[PDB]
């Protein structure tokens, strides 16, 4: 490795992406970790860990599963708008065919939402209600089927992903690499997409080498996490298909339905 015009350009690209990341996403990983580790004075989230604590936190706030998925997708509109705004800052993205821009984003947003969801998770549970609540992992897992199976694969991804100890500067480039995936179905001009991702991948590799001296093959390990993200998305699409094809009267507490709407 040498400090040459090429490496300096890749550092400028990483800094540009980081600055747009900060402007586009008001809730960063650093802010989420500060809440989870009990270092935010102004924020002491209420902990929901069983049915008793669920009903005690009531004031702090068609199949049931479909309404949850409709509700959380509606609450995820802001995230989609922010991810879309971030993509405009990726050099070359707006010059692509508009159909390809929509295709890259319509598949990419789900993977990025799960990436950001992992920042809200530790081994014990996940932040909800704009950092004002904390829903434990085992309470979610204990809920009746199919609801008890919704979040557990995402916690399993989150613990492996968070063990990489990426920061917001790492995540900014990683998210850009997700968006510029030239293997999405329906893409018209794959080559200009791959040319941009090649630059983002070079910027990502250099960023990880400089920022994580104690990691081995972190570049490869991070890319393998895209395989986990796509598996999570595919499982949801499959579960919705079988839910659309199975008629099951599913009862769930309205407070739990509201909480699931803050998840994904």
């Amino acid at each position: 490795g040498q400090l040459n015009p090429e490496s300096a350009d890749l550092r400028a690209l990483a800094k540009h992406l980081y600055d747009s990341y900060i402007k586009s996403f008001p809730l960063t990983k650093a802010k989420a970790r500060a809440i989870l580790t009990g270092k935010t004075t102004d924020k002491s989230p209420f902990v929901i860990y069983d049915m008793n604590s669920l009903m005690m936190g009531e004031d702090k706030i068609k199949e049931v599963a479909i309404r949850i998925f409709q509700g959380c997708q509606f609450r995820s509109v802001e995230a989609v708008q922010e991810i879309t705004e971030y993509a405009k800052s990726i050099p070359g993205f707006v010059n692509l065919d508009l159909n390809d821009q929509v295709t890259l984003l319509k598949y990419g947003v789900h993977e990025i939402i799960y990436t950001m969801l992992a920042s809200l998770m530790n081994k014990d549970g996940v932040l909800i209600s704009e950092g004002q609540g904390f829903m434990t992992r085992e309470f979610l897992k204990s809920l009746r089927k199919p609801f008890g199976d919704f979040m557990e694969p995402k916690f399993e991804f989150a613990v492996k992903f968070n063990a990489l100890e990426l920061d917001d500067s790492d995540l900014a480039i990683f998210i850009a690499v997700i968006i510029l995936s030239g293997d999405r179905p329906g893409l018209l001009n794959v080559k200009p997409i791959e040319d941009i991702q090649d630059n983002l991948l070079q910027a990502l590799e250099l960023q990880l080498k400089l920022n994580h001296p104690e990691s081995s093959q972190l570049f490869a390990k991070l890319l393998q996490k895209m395989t986990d993200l796509r598996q999570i998305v595919t499982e949801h699409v499959q579960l919705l298909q079988v839910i659309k094809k199975t008629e099951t009267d599913m009862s769930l507490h309205p407070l739990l339905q509201e909480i699931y709407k803050d998840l994904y």
Binding site: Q73, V77, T84, V102, K106
Partner: peptide
Amino acid sequence: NLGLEDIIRKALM
């Protein structure tokens, strides 16, 4: 989801 594509299209404007 067409609603999602529409959200993305309006945001891209």
